[PDB]
Amino acid sequence: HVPELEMLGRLGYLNHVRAASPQDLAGGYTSSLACHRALQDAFSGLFWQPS
Amino acid sequence: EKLDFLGEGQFATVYKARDKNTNQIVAIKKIKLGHRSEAKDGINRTALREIKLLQELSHPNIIGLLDAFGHKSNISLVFDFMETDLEVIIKDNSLVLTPSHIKAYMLMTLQGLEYLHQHWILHRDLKPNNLLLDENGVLKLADFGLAKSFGSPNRAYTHQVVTRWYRAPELLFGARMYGVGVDMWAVGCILAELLLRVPFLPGDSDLDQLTRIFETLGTPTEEQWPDMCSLPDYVTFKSFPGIPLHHIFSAAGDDLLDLIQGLFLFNPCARITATQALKMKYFSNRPGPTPGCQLPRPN
Amino acid sequence: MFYHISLEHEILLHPRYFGPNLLNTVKQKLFTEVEGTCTGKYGFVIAVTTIDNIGAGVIQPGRGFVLYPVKYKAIVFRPFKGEVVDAVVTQVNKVGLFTEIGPMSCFISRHSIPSEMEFDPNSNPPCYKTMDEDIVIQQDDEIRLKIVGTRVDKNDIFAIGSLMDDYLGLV
Amino acid sequence: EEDASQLIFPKEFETAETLLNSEVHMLLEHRKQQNESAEDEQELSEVFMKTLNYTARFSRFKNRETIASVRSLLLQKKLHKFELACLANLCPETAEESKALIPSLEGRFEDEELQQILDDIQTKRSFQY
Amino acid sequence: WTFSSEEQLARLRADANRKFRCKAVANGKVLPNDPVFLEPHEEMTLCKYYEKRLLEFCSVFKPAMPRSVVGTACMYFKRFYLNNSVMEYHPRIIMLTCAFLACKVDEFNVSSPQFVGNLRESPLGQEKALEQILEYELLLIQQLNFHLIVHNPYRPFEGFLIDLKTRYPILENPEILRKTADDFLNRIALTDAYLLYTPSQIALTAILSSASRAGITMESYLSESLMLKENRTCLSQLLDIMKSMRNLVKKYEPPRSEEVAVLKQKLERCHSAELA
């Protein structure tokens, strides 16, 4: 980047709008229920096991 | 306590001022930064690992370090003083001649890069002047303003960095991954500059630098350097063959050609490193290098 | 000038000439067809380097033969106006010198010959010698000329040359 | 029209790779090995024997990697594909002789750098066989 | 940097709380021995709630933050409180100072307004937050004892995945074993296993832990060799370490919602009482 001052211009403008439409979707309880379903399927899956 | 002024630099002005307590001469390199702005980054951590981790690592081929102090705005560096550099030997001043003294330069340069690669440290700032010389003639580096701690995998990082004169062929195209060949590319470029005493790669930006390198070394083919068309940022040029390296340089022995060819290899996975370079037939002959006493110094 | 580009020509194969390996039959026939010929766009095809790609079999009504668009890369030879190459003297006549550059025939007019090397019809072997007998240019000699004008014709292309230029003679 | 003195080339022969005598003689030598160590059943022709003999009559190189080295130094300068083969196949001696064969060479770089370029060509030139 | 065992960390952070009490009593402002201060056992909850919130702040960062950048800020929050208490320095500014001081050395294209524009408040309130970071940015450097030799477990994690997809032709799908292993490295990051173990053996433990719970149990992997195992040389000094890493994750107490709201109220009374 560039030091000195300069950056004080659009400082507050970028703070309000960071990215164009941020990917903030709650598809699975704040993106956390899908992590629990993947762990449960590994403990009891289709792995062939003896008796 | 200001003493004398030297010169400027890329992003830091060198000041020759004697520091306190320690009687050694300190060359303060003040980095121009900001402090007037509110939410300002101020100090950049690109040199934080330099003035905090260099005190632990001790090596003769690596520059020293004493203390460090600052406050966002003015970050005064505390480093040992050096006599001259390497650009003054070739550029402008042409009276200082080194008859068969280049062997001592590459011998002390590969040892400094080998010690940094062992601790997972890359010197991503190679340019024909960092090789600082002291009174005893000990070849040491300059500053670590672009160092980084890497590991086994190689991911994407910064681009369009490093001095445009000494640029790796994989860095000009904007490749996301890299490796040891980044620091091993400018090793032969500095060696090629001390032979003919002329700029070996006088190029401009990333587009002009590709023309000078390819017209002299060649174009990476499929058998040479694979994986080339898969990169998005790619340009199609002419089918450059390859100029030999034993006719461009006049004063060059047979053992010297065994090292220059291995350093200018377009394959980073097959490029020679520092351990295999010191075990070649060039650093094990009759013309032994000089310790540093017989090496001349500029005016 | 010797070049190396890619050529594409339609090769017709006889229906009886198939054999076990159909790809080997088309390859052996390609070397005995396009070689030795010359075109006005590519040049004199000498030999075929490496076969690139071979097309499928195109069948058209009224023509029992089979077609295979075989793509390859063969060397050519197309002279240009202003090329300076060597030649071999084949015939010497009082009207003009007859030289040939490989499969290409050249021609040198009388006005392009200096007055020193005058034709001598006295001796049996025709040659162009000077007055002081310095150099002798006779049959089967290595000389040099400059191409003035090229011309293509079936296979034996024509390219007139000149001799008045300097730095020539027996090289 | 086409002109080799002013580099007036058509759209088909503008970026084409040029070949010299020893290069064509090397590729034609591989065809001769396919007739001696295999022969198959088909015979060649007299044109192949006359072309192979004409290339070796004016050839001056031997090794494969040596030929590719001559075409390398003649490319980094502001030249052309046609001027590259004229300075590699004929193998000029002096710097003034190079410009006498190419009319478009005088209007380029000076003779101070051209003398160093011809030093590598004369070094790799096989004087004897 | 690694230390030794859990008993060593039980005395380093305990002496930091008693060190601040020596300067708060000898002043005549706060009554000695009162519930106003925070107990050393109560500081464990504050070191877990703000650490989990720091992980969520890095996930919603723009653009895509690298893996080693997230784990870098977690190493600065633990080594700072080894010599200081949580009452003198509020964790609200500490977790933002450690995150702002851990996004440059990894060669990431980021500027000053890009890191600030991430909270959910007014733009004018974000300007005062960085002004207090400068007062703690210079102090955070001196509190690290000049120790920046740090290595995140996400770096050697990509090296073990190549050995499994090459020596074992069956296990050729590294995308399946990647999601089940990233969650294990995040749970162990909240404990104290980074300052007590080698960062090279942490990535190896996540491979055997995520594979044993799925069914595919490698029995010949321990008999092979992969660059001196990135740990020790003997085989007996390898099973006792992996069993201790999973014990800290199972015994990890999550931050209770009924305790964070109480500790934050008692912590604000010390900062508003003029150095207390």
PDB file of C-alpha atoms in Angstrom, chain E residues 1-15 82 192 195-196:
ATOM      1  CA  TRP E   1       6.256 -21.838  21.722  1.00  0.00           C
ATOM      2  CA  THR E   2       5.874 -25.063  23.691  1.00  0.00           C
ATOM      3  CA  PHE E   3       6.500 -25.133  27.442  1.00  0.00           C
ATOM      4  CA  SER E   4       6.206 -28.435  29.357  1.00  0.00           C
ATOM      5  CA  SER E   5       2.975 -29.597  31.024  1.00  0.00           C
ATOM      6  CA  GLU E   6      -0.313 -28.159  32.269  1.00  0.00           C
ATOM      7  CA  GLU E   7       1.142 -27.578  35.751  1.00  0.00           C
ATOM      8  CA  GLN E   8       3.481 -24.900  34.372  1.00  0.00           C
ATOM      9  CA  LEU E   9       0.627 -22.857  32.888  1.00  0.00           C
ATOM     10  CA  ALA E  10      -1.275 -23.104  36.190  1.00  0.00           C
ATOM     11  CA  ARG E  11       1.392 -20.919  37.850  1.00  0.00           C
ATOM     12  CA  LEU E  12       2.256 -18.466  35.057  1.00  0.00           C
ATOM     13  CA  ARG E  13      -1.232 -16.981  34.685  1.00  0.00           C
ATOM     14  CA  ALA E  14      -1.816 -17.251  38.446  1.00  0.00           C
ATOM     15  CA  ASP E  15       1.144 -14.990  39.250  1.00  0.00           C
ATOM     16  CA  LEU E  82       0.810 -15.019  30.964  1.00  0.00           C
ATOM     17  CA  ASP E 192      -3.906 -24.976  25.912  1.00  0.00           C
ATOM     18  CA  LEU E 195       1.701 -23.790  24.169  1.00  0.00           C
ATOM     19  CA  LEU E 196       2.464 -27.309  25.453  1.00  0.00           C
TER      20      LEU E 196
END
